[PDB]
Amino acid sequence: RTATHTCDYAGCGKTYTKSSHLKAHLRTHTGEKPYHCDWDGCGWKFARSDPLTRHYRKHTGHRPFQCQKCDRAFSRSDHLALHMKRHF
DNA sequence: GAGGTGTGGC
DNA sequence: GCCACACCTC
Ligand SMILES: [Zn+2]
Ligand SMILES: [Zn+2]
Ligand SMILES: [Zn+2]
């Protein structure tokens, strides 16, 4: 009646709290990657949606994160964070 | 730079 | 489910 979301694969008894995390984990067993990049010529596929959204910034040149000292811009927040270490 | 992924807010 | 942070790995 009330229980955690479990992976019913024989060799996997792992569990998750969010249903979305289990659905993503199942794709590691089947190898499915339903999130396709429609950019003509790319062909990349991903198991989750967020790496595709992130990947897409490569094509669009979207770089919201900018260093306010040297003016260099990045497409990801983790890239800016690492860059800031250069200004310590 | 970039993908892969654990985790969480909405 | 979507999106994003943060960390890992190459
Ligand atoms: Zn599993
Ligand atoms: Zn692409
Ligand atoms: Zn800078």
Side-chain angles (χ1 to χ4, degrees):
Chain A
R1 218 182 289 162
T2 58
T4 182
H5 300 96
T6 60
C7 175
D8 288 26
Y9 272 85
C12 182
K14 184 155 49 175
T15 177
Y16 294 90
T17 183
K18 270 196 171 67
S19 177
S20 184
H21 294 174
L22 178 63
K23 295 178 180 180
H25 173 54
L26 297 177
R27 297 191 180 90
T28 67
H29 296 260
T30 69
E32 187 190 11
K33 297 183 178 181
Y35 299 96
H36 302 4
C37 179
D38 57 329
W39 186 269
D40 289 89
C42 182
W44 267 93
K45 300 178 180 179
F46 301 88
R48 323 199 311 193
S49 78
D50 51 287
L52 172 58
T53 306
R54 183 179 60 183
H55 162 85
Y56 226 83
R57 289 185 163 84
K58 178 195 297 180
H59 304 300
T60 62
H62 190 195
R63 298 179 179 180
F65 309 91
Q66 189 180 14
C67 176
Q68 307 180 45
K69 160 159 181 139
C70 73
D71 305 329
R72 281 185 58 176
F74 303 91
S75 64
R76 296 156 49 159
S77 66
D78 63 343
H79 287 174
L80 173 59
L82 287 170
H83 169 80
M84 291 303 303
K85 295 188 187 296
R86 301 175 60 82
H87 298 336
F88 292 176

